[PDB]
From Swiss-Prot, chain A:
This is Large ribosomal subunit protein uL5A. Component of the large ribosomal subunit (LSU). Mature yeast ribosomes consist of a small (40S) and a large (60S) subunit. The 40S small subunit contains 1 molecule of ribosomal RNA (18S rRNA) and 33 different proteins (encoded by 57 genes). The large 60S subunit contains 3 rRNA molecules (25S, 5.8S and 5S rRNA) and 46 different proteins (encoded by 81 genes). Component of a hexameric 5S RNP precursor complex, composed of 5S RNA, RRS1, RPF2, RPL5, RPL11A/RPL11B and SYO1; this complex acts as a precursor for ribosome assembly. GO terms for biological process: cytoplasmic translation; ribosomal large subunit assembly; translation. Pfam families: Ribosomal_L5, Ribosomal_L5_C. The modification N6,N6,N6-trimethyllysine is found at K68.
Swiss-Prot record, chain B:
Acts as an adapter for the XPO1/CRM1-mediated export of the 60S ribosomal subunit. Unlikely to play a significant role in nonsense-mediated mRNA decay (NMD). The chain holds residues 153 to 405 of 518 of the full protein. It is found in: Cytoplasm; Nucleus, Nucleoplasm. Belongs to the NMD3 family. Present with 11900 molecules/cell in log phase SD medium. It comes from Saccharomyces cerevisiae (strain ATCC 204508 / S288c). This is 60S ribosomal export protein NMD3. The lineage of its organism: Eukaryota, Fungi, Dikarya, Ascomycota, Saccharomycotina. Associates with the 60S ribosomal subunit.
UniProtKB/Swiss-Prot annotation, chain C:
Present with 2830 molecules/cell in log phase SD medium. This is mRNA export factor MEX67. Involved in the export of mRNA from the nucleus to the cytoplasm. Disulfide bonds: none annotated. The lineage of its organism: Eukaryota, Fungi, Dikarya, Ascomycota, Saccharomycotina. It is found in: Nucleus; Cytoplasm. Belongs to the NXF family. Interacts with nucleoporin complex NUP84 and MTR2. Interacts with MIP6. The leucine-rich repeats and the NTF2-domain are essential for the export of mRNA from the nucleus. The NTF2 domain heterodimerizes with MTR2. The formation of this heterodimer is essential for mRNA export and binds to all of the nucleoporin-FG-repeats. The chain holds residues 3 to 120 of 599 of the full protein.
From Swiss-Prot, chain D:
Coiled coil: none annotated. The gene is RPL1A. GO terms for cellular component: cytosol; cytosolic large ribosomal subunit. Component of the ribosome, a large ribonucleoprotein complex responsible for the synthesis of proteins in the cell. The small ribosomal subunit (SSU) binds messenger RNAs (mRNAs) and translates the encoded message by selecting cognate aminoacyl-transfer RNA (tRNA) molecules. The large subunit (LSU) contains the ribosomal catalytic site termed the peptidyl transferase center (PTC), which catalyzes the formation of peptide bonds, thereby polymerizing the amino acids delivered by tRNAs into a polypeptide chain. Component of the large ribosomal subunit (LSU). Mature yeast ribosomes consist of a small (40S) and a large (60S) subunit. The 40S small subunit contains 1 molecule of ribosomal RNA (18S rRNA) and 33 different proteins (encoded by 57 genes). The large 60S subunit contains 3 rRNA molecules (25S, 5.8S and 5S rRNA) and 46 different proteins (encoded by 81 genes). uL1 forms part of the L1 stalk. This is Large ribosomal subunit protein uL1A. The modification Phosphoserine is found at S79, S86.
RNA sequence: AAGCUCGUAUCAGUUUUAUGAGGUAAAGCGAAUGAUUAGAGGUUCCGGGGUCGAAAUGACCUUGACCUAUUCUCAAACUUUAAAUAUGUAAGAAGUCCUUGUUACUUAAUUGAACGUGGACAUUUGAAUGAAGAGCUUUUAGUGGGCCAUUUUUGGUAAGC
RNA sequence: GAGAACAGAAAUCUCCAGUAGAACAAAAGGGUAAAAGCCCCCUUGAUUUUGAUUUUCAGUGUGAAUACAAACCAUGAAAGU
């Protein structure tokens, strides 16, 4: 009755090896794709093989909640032709994938932007997950209400009519 | 009490630059052929010797690479141990110096406000504002010694804005005049400094250079406060960084 | 970050004004451009002086110390996008409109 | 110098304002500048002192400040209706070496972005500072119109190899008492900037940009 | 040494009862800390500096970074428990209880806090044993090289070190 | 630890475990988790006047520290500090 396995978060992130015009480009791409303004993220530490110093921006990401989440998810499954591979599924019950050549997402073929890639990650839950997110009287989830791998795989196999190979 | 000869090399500076140069030269000539053992110290090291012949030839080798002063001491066991205390002149290269007045007048009427430019068996100073050098010997130093104004830890960075010249060079050094700013307020203020220096042939506009900033400095020095106020500059530039990758 | 490593500095354009505006009547017999470039570079390429010949027997455009020293040495010794305009034309010739 | 009963400068300003537009009603070129020569100081032997002493009173309204910046300050400069520049535009400016020595002459000053000024040091190469046009930075939240007003009203005393520093201290337009306040402020700034606070200053002269023979200072 | 104010005080190189504090001996490490020592390569994972250099597609150097696929091993500068010996305080008259006076402090207040007026409580007045009188002041001498013994210890193979 | 295009010890995102094994300028020891750590907002109490107390101790000085009083302020919704 309450246990439903609905969509909690759809997170879209684009990671860039450079720190040039490409980050502003992917920022405009994410602001055109999602209906919200994105957030650029600073590098944690320094690498010098990726050519990365700390405190300078690397990647862009945005989070989507609501019906636009399952809209973007249906578009991504249409790109992935409704196939996952029995990896890409966490034990905790989240799942994601990655998309090369983002022109097949309603994005046009503008050369002022060009070609990018994306990562989509879907966080799943059940009702009553406020108990771990509130401030006063925080608690946990009992060991029958948690979303697990087999629950997510069976529920979102039977809906979206997808396939999980191997 | 088992060696009979000890040589104790010291330098009373936190950053022992001349001492590390000396250690590289001892390791690159291998003058440590006949050392019994080596004792570390806070400001140097002690070499041990079975007879005093290798010790006195170590003194002979050290008397021609570095500006030192050595003294001899005699021990008794009841046959006599010998101890050789060697002190290096505690002024390293690229250090800022205010000279005593009589020494500065007798050493070519050079300015007192100088920079240590080369260290050899003697030591060499140079005026950065007008290209002019001088040679001070270890014995005339140790006759009445003095200390340095600033060492290489308070070197602040500078961003070169513009270059000029005056035409005069003395070989390897083109005495020019450059306008410069600090990289802690280049994007904050409109504060520019005008420095007549010897980094003219080596520097071009837009890069970073190390220097001493005298206008932000609490100096407690009688040689410094016996100067004049208008004839001491604000910035003394020393060296360019120039990192390739 | 942005356009950073454009290399508009480090001896290319700045600090190239150490000239000396003296009486300029240097010793100069024959120092012209073609024979100067040939006698300078017969094995590689080189970078030339600002304005140095012996046409008027006067030269003061050796604005550096090594420049003035080499000028005094040859005084004291007697001596003597852009590919797009073809690429797009080749591509338009390759795109014959008959075969489409 | 220590100030010397400024009624002489008052009569000099009145004679200058009766010279301009009351004996020669010329076209609108009002700039009553103050020229000051210093005495008893060696340029090489003494320190080359400088400061800026920006008085909010303005006299040079027509100025050119090609705001070099990014995209947000480019939109802010288009809002403030001043000549701006772009990043690729400045890249082409550093590409063509002869264009920089000309753009330093078609402009009158500059005002940079606290995000691109630590590059004008090297990207926009030398002779900009030799023509004394190093750009002053403007932040991401300060007013661009106010910064342009300040960069049009900011006066700066710098010690060159010559002892003859002149500054566009006023206009010949109006406001005798405000002009007297401007002359007092400029004399105070020069006297405090010099080494001896009174003795070094020798020559003071007013000229309303017309080679007028009325200094009387 | 000179005394002075007084007359059995409320004191003690001690015990008892009550109540605190400690981290050594012993235990235990294997319950978390379990170690020096001679310890092989892996370079654009770091690189400390030192010398030159009209400077950067910048050459010349060596301790070391990091033990990488090695554990048993145990502590005066490790911890869970924790003696004995030594240590602070209290065992009342300057006390307890009842009643109600002062204040410019404190309370929402007629509440408190501190100091009191009046009244009640001596055969034991609140554990033991002792008490050579108790308390207080002024002034001044010599000394300021120490050594030995049992026990507990630190540095030196060790000594009458 | 389990997941996500390029991604490969190690770049960005998501979840679970995590009594502190991190951080708090520097030596070592102590202390700290809706904080003393990290990220933001406002500020100048790092102010004025002088007494008392603790450590070293002769219960002198110097240094450092503790708790009030009389003013003026900061911060916070506030108690407070
Ligand atoms: Mg034990
Ligand atoms: Mg009573
Ligand atoms: Mg005595
Ligand atoms: Mg005696
Ligand atoms: Mg004290």
């Amino acid at each position: 009755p309450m246990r439903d396995l609905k969509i909690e978060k759809l997170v879209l992130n684009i990671s860039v090896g450079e720190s040039g015009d490409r980050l502003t480009r992917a920022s405009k791409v994410l602001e055109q794709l999602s209906g919200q303004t994105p957030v650029q993220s600073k590098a944690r530490y320094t690498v010098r093989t990726f050519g990365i110093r700390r405190n300078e921006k690397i990647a862009v990401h945005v989070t989507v909640r609501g019906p636009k989440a399952e809209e973007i998810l249906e578009r991504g499954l249409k790109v992935k032709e409704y196939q996952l591979r029995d990896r890409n599924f966490s034990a905790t019950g989240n799942f994601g994938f990655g998309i090369d050549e983002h022109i097949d997402l309603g994005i046009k073929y503008d050369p002022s932007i060009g070609i990018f890639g994306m990562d989509f990650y879907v966080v799943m839950n059940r009702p009553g997950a406020r108990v771990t997110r509130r401030k006063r009287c925080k608690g946990t989830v009992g060991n029958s209400h948690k979303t697990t791998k087999e629950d997510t795989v069976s529920w979102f196999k039977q809906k979206y009519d997808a396939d999980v190979l191997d | 009490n088992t060696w009979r000869a000890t040589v104790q090399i010291r330098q009373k500076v936190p950053h022992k630059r001349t001492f590390l140069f000396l250690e590289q030269l001892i390791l690159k000539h291998n003058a440590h052929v006949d050392t019994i053992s080596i004792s570390e110290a806070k400001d140097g090291l002690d070499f041990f010797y079975a007879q005093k012949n290798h010790a006195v030839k170590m003194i002979d080798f050290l008397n021609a690479v570095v500006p030192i002063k050595h003294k001899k001491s005699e021990e008794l066991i009841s046959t006599y141990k010998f101890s050789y205390s060697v002190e290096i002149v505690p002024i390293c290269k690229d250090d800022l110096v205010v000279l005593p007045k009589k020494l500065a007048k007798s050493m070519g009427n050079i300015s007192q406000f100088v920079l240590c430019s080369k260290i050899s068996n003697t030591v060499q100073f140079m005026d950065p504002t007008t290209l002019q050098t001088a040679d001070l010997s270890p014995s005339v130093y140790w006759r009445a010694p003095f200390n340095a104004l600033a060492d290489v830890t308070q070197l602040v960075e500078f961003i070169v804005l513009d270059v000029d010249s005056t035409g005069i060079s003395r070989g390897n050094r083109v005495l020019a005049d450059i306008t410069v700013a600090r990289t802690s307020d280049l994007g904050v203020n409109d504060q520019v400094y005008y420095v007549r220096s010897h980094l003219g042939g080596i520097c071009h506009a837009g890069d970073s250079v190390m220097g001493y900033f005298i206008a932000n400095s609490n100096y407690n020095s009688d040689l410094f406060d016996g100067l004049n106020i208008d004839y001491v500059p604000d910035v003394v530039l020393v060296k360019k960084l120039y990192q390739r990758k | 970050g942005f356009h950073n490593v454009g290399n508009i500095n480090m001896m290319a354009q700045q600090q190239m004004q150490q000239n000396r505006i003296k009486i300029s009547v240097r010793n100069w017999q024959n120092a012209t451009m073609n024979d100067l470039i040939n006698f300078i570079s017969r094995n590689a390429r080189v970078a030339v002086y600002d304005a140095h010949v012996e046409g008027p027997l006067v030269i003061g455009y050796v604005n550096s110390k090594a420049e003035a020293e080499s000028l005094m040495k040859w005084n004291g010794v007697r001596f003597a996008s852009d590919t797009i305009s073809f690429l797009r034309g080749v591509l338009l010739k390759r795109y014959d409109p008959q075969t489409k | 110098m220590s100030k010397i009963t400024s009624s002489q400068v008052r009569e000099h300003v009145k004679e200058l304002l009766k010279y301009s537009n009351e004996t020669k009603k010329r076209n609108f070129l009002e700039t009553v500048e103050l020229q000051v020569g210093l005495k008893n100081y060696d340029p090489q032997r003494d320190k080359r002192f400088s400061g800026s002493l920006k008085l909010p009173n303005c006299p040079r309204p027509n100025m050119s400040i090609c705001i070099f910046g990014d995209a947000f300050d480019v939109d802010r400069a288009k809002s403030c209706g001043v000549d701006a520049m772009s990043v690729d535009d400045l890249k082409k400016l550093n590409k063509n070496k002869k264009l920089i020595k000309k753009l330093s002459k078609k402009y009158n000053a500059f005002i940079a972005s606290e995000v691109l000024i630590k590059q004008v040091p090297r990207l926009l190469g030398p002779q900009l500072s030799k023509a004394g046009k190093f750009p002053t930075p403007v932040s991401h939240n300060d007013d661009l119109y106010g910064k342009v007003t300040d960069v049009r009203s900011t006066i700066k005393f710098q010690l060159k190899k010559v002892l003859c520093l002149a500054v566009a201290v006023g206009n010949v337009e109006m406001e005798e008492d405000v002009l007297v306040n401007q002359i007092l402020m400029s004399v105070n700034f020069f006297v405090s900037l010099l080494k001896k606070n009174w003795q070094n200053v020798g020559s003071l002269v007013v000229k309303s940009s017309m080679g007028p023979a009325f200094r009387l200072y």
